[PDB]
Amino acid sequence: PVNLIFCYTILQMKVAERIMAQHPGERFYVVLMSENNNEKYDYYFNQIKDKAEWAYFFHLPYGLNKSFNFIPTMAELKVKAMLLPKVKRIYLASLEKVSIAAFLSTYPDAEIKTFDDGTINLIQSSSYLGDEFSVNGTIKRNFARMMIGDWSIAKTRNASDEHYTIFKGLKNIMDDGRRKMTYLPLFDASELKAGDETGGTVRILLGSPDKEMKEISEKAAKNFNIQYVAPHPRQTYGLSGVTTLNSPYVIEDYILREIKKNPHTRYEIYTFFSGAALTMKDFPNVHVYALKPASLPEDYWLKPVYALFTQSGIPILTFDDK
Amino acid sequence: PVNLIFCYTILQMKVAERIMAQHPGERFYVVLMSENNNEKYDYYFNQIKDKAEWAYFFHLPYGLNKSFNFIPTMAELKVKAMLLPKVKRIYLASLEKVSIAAFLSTYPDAEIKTFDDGTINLIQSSSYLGDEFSVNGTIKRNFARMMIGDWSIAKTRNASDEHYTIFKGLKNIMDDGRRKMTYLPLFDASELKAGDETGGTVRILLGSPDKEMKEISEKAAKNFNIQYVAPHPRQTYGLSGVTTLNSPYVIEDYILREIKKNPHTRYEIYTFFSGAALTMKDFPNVHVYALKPASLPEDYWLKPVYALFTQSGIPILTFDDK
Numbered sequence: 139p140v141n142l143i144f145c146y147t148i149l150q151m152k153v154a155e156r157i158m159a160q161h162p163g164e165r166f167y168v169v170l171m172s173e174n175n176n177e178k179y180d181y182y183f184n185q186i187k188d189k190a191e192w193a194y195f196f197h198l199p200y201g202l203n204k205s206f207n208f209i210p211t212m213a214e215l216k217v218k219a220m221l222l223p224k225v226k227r228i229y230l231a232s233l234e235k236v237s238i239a240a241f242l243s244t245y246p247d248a249e250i251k252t253f254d255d256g257t258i259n260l261i262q263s264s265s266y267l268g269d270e271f272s273v274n275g276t277i278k279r280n281f282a283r284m285m286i287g288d289w290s291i292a293k294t295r296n297a298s299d300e301h302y303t304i305f306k307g308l309k310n311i312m313d314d315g316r317r318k319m320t321y322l323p324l325f326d327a328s329e330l331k332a333g334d335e336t337g338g339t340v341r342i343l344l345g346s347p348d349k350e351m352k353e354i355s356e357k358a359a360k361n362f363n364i365q366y367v368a369p370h371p372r373q374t375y376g377l378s379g380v381t382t383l384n385s386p387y388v389i390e391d392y393i394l395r396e397i398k399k400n401p402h403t404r405y406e407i408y409t410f411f412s413g414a415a416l417t418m419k420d421f422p423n424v425h426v427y428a429l430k431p432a433s434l435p436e437d438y439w440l441k442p443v444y445a446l447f448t449q450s451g452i453p454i455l456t457f458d459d460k
Numbered sequence: 461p462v463n464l465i466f467c468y469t470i471l472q473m474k475v476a477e478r479i480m481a482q483h484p485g486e487r488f489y490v491v492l493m494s495e496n497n498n499e500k501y502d503y504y505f506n507q508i509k510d511k512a513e514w515a516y517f518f519h520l521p522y523g524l525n526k527s528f529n530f531i532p533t534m535a536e537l538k539v540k541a542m543l544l545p546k547v548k549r550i551y552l553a554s555l556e557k558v559s560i561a562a563f564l565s566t567y568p569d570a571e572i573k574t575f576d577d578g579t580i581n582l583i584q585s586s587s588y589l590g591d592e593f594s595v596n597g598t599i600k601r602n603f604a605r606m607m608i609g610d611w612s613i614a615k616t617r618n619a620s621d622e623h624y625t626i627f628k629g630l631k632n633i634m635d636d637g638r639r640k641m642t643y644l645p646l647f648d649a650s651e652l653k654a655g656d657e658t659g660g661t662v663r664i665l666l667g668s669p670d671k672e673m674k675e676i677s678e679k680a681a682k683n684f685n686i687q688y689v690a691p692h693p694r695q696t697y698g699l700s701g702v703t704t705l706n707s708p709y710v711i712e713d714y715i716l717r718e719i720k721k722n723p724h725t726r727y728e729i730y731t732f733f734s735g736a737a738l739t740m741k742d743f744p745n746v747h748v749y750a751l752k753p754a755s756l757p758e759d760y761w762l763k764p765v766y767a768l769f770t771q772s773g774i775p776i777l778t779f780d781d782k
């Protein structure tokens with residue numbers, strides 16, 4: 139059972155030390171957040187880091203704080219005012235309305251617009267009320283209760299007049315009639331120039347960052363005659379028996395580039411339900427398949443995942459991974 | 461007139477690019493906040509950094525986000541729950557109740573306690589209503605209106621039952637009868653062991669981080685026969701004609717150490733109204749003097765500064781710096 143201490147000055151770090159002293163042997167996680175980095179801050183952060191179970195130094199940019207911990211001189215007031223950006227518009231992910239609410243309030247006249255957080259935006263309200271998520275005290279119900287509370291805040295606090303979504307024609311959690319819904323594709327079909335799939339077929343497995351998925355991935359590659367793996371940005375193990383694509387791009391960027399260079403090629407994307415399937419749903423010459431290993435429980439994924447994939451016309455291919 | 465974009469994923473960075481594309485030549489400040497650092501995040505941050513006027517990558521710790529931008533698997537839900545700290549107590553600076561309100565709400569059952577932000581805590585409510593701060597549209601009135609709004613939030617939202625102050629016997633802005641006020645000194649007199657000032661006198665000027673203060677500082681040192689300067693943690697210029705103390709400690713730490721080693725020495729601290737004067741007000745064998753250069757306007761400092769210094773028994777020494 140931990141105590142947290144949040145500090146943004148050296149003296150607050152000393153105070154934090156005094157508090158720790160009065161609670162000897164208890165567990166403390168100390169956070170320092172400052173815009174200034176200099177010898178003294180590091181010296182004092184190191185000091186409190188030796189005394190706490192866990193400490194972190196969040197580094198911020200110069201000018202972030204509109205507020206003052208000290209009593210400013212008139213000059214310091216002038217400097218601060220004539221430095222602050224004059225902000226006309228803030229764009230942020232719908233759920234960042236919750237996590238950065240405090241900052242939005244310091245710019246009450248800015249026009250706010252939101253964009254998809256990601257595939258989280260595709261779970262409808264009524265789905266959070268589903269029986270899956272309605273057992274009191276369970277992990278799934280805590281998730282749903284947390285989402286419902288946050289969407290409510292994102293939708294009704296700090297008014298925003300527009301939401302950009304990257305998912306054409308799936309109902310968005312943000313579409314509540316209090317804002318314009320605007321489709322914002324990741325590409326322009328005009329610049330891509332894809333034509334008829336008269337050329338060949340390229341098969342790619344989307345790698346998983348979970349290492350327990352290694353054998354299952356390797357078995358999928360064989361079972362389905364898949365030439366390539368595109369590793370996940372956080373994937374840290376290698377897959378054998380398949381050609382790994384070493385590219386600097388995430389899959390959507392990689393595939394859009396390859397389509398432009400190969401406008402007649404058929405790309406087949408196979409995945410263990412990555413959100414990239416929903417993100418690439420409407421890319422030309424792209425055909426997504428979901429893979430379902432028999433050895434995983436039917437409820438490995440939440441029910442809305444199957445429903446979005448199915449609504450989106452994405453086949454689910456089951457296979458006995460043994 | 462700037463636009464801000466806040467992002468916490470790679471794809472949100474692409475979206476941010478699309479938005480920028482639709483607003484060609486306008487000014488954009490882009491912020492990326494993530495717990496994950498890997499090749500792909502840096503590649504994509506660099507990319508958007510080449511496209512925006514200003515961009516920053518705030519690095520956060522692993523686990524910070526209780527929320528999800530994607531639809532989690534059951535396994536990912538389990539991992540997240542069994543990782544989150546069980547928090548019993550949060551200590552934070554009174555004004556951090558405002559800036560980190562969003563985080564407090566994710567731990568609604570934690571006991572919250574606050575401590576001084578700093579000398580800002582010593583300006584009373586009625587003082588913000590002073591005539592100095594009551595001219596509509598001025599920089600001082602915007603400051604007061606901002607403080608009044610934030611203290612109100614800090615005092616009445618997310619209930620906290622106790623405030624630690626480091627300033628004995630000056631009225632605190634947080635003392636509103638909705639919390640215990642607790643004095644928390646920076647030292648124990650029991651461990652310091654200061655005795656009668658039978659030894660010698662040490663005179664120290666507190667350096668200023670403002671370089672326009674250089675000549676004035678150097679003239680003060682001569683006029684007042686001050687042996688030493690203790691530079692401010694952000695001071696970046698050197699003072700001539702005085703011995704600069706090269707120490708790793710801030711003044712309060714330095715002086716407490718020197719007192720313990722020299723319990724009969726008289727320390728005289730001279731300052732251009734540093735908050736360290738108020739912080740060290742009640743240190744044994746310490747005698748603080750405020751310095752007021754004739755060449756600065758009478759309103760260089762705000763009126764509550766003079767009043768706190770005067771209430772605290774701190775002489776103000778005027779001198780014609782020429």
Ligand SMILES: CC(=O)N[C@@H]1[C@@H](O)[C@@H](F)[C@@](OP(=O)(O)OC[C@H]2O[C@@H](n3ccc(N)nc3=O)[C@H](O)[C@@H]2O)(C(=O)O)O[C@H]1[C@H](O)[C@H](O)CO
Pocket residue numbers: 255256257343344345346347368369370371372387388389390411412413414417469470471472496529530
């Ligand atoms: C905080 C957190 O966990 N974030 C995770 C990310 O670290 C990863 F863990 C995961 O990834 P997941 O659904 O599969 O896919 C998310 C994005 O990762 C890229 N990708 C994925 C697989 C692959 N083989 N090649 C790729 O290039 C695509 O751009 C895709 O749209 C997850 O659920 O495992 O979910 C994402 C976020 O949803 C995403 O990073 C931003 O939209």
Ligand SMILES: CC(=O)N[C@@H]1[C@@H](O)[C@@H](F)[C@@](OP(=O)(O)OC[C@H]2O[C@@H](n3ccc(N)nc3=O)[C@H](O)[C@@H]2O)(C(=O)O)O[C@H]1[C@H](O)[C@H](O)CO
Pocket residue numbers: 147148149150174207208577578579665666667668669690691692693694709710711712733734735736739
């Ligand atoms: C964000 C921001 O501007 N922060 C500023 C700091 O960078 C500096 F700019 C200033 O400093 P100021 O009142 O003089 O004093 C603040 C603290 O700095 C240390 N000190 C100061 C002068 C000196 N010669 N030797 C020292 O060791 C002491 O610990 C003192 O209590 C300012 O008003 O100029 O105010 C502080 C904060 O109030 C302080 O850092 C935390 O309490």
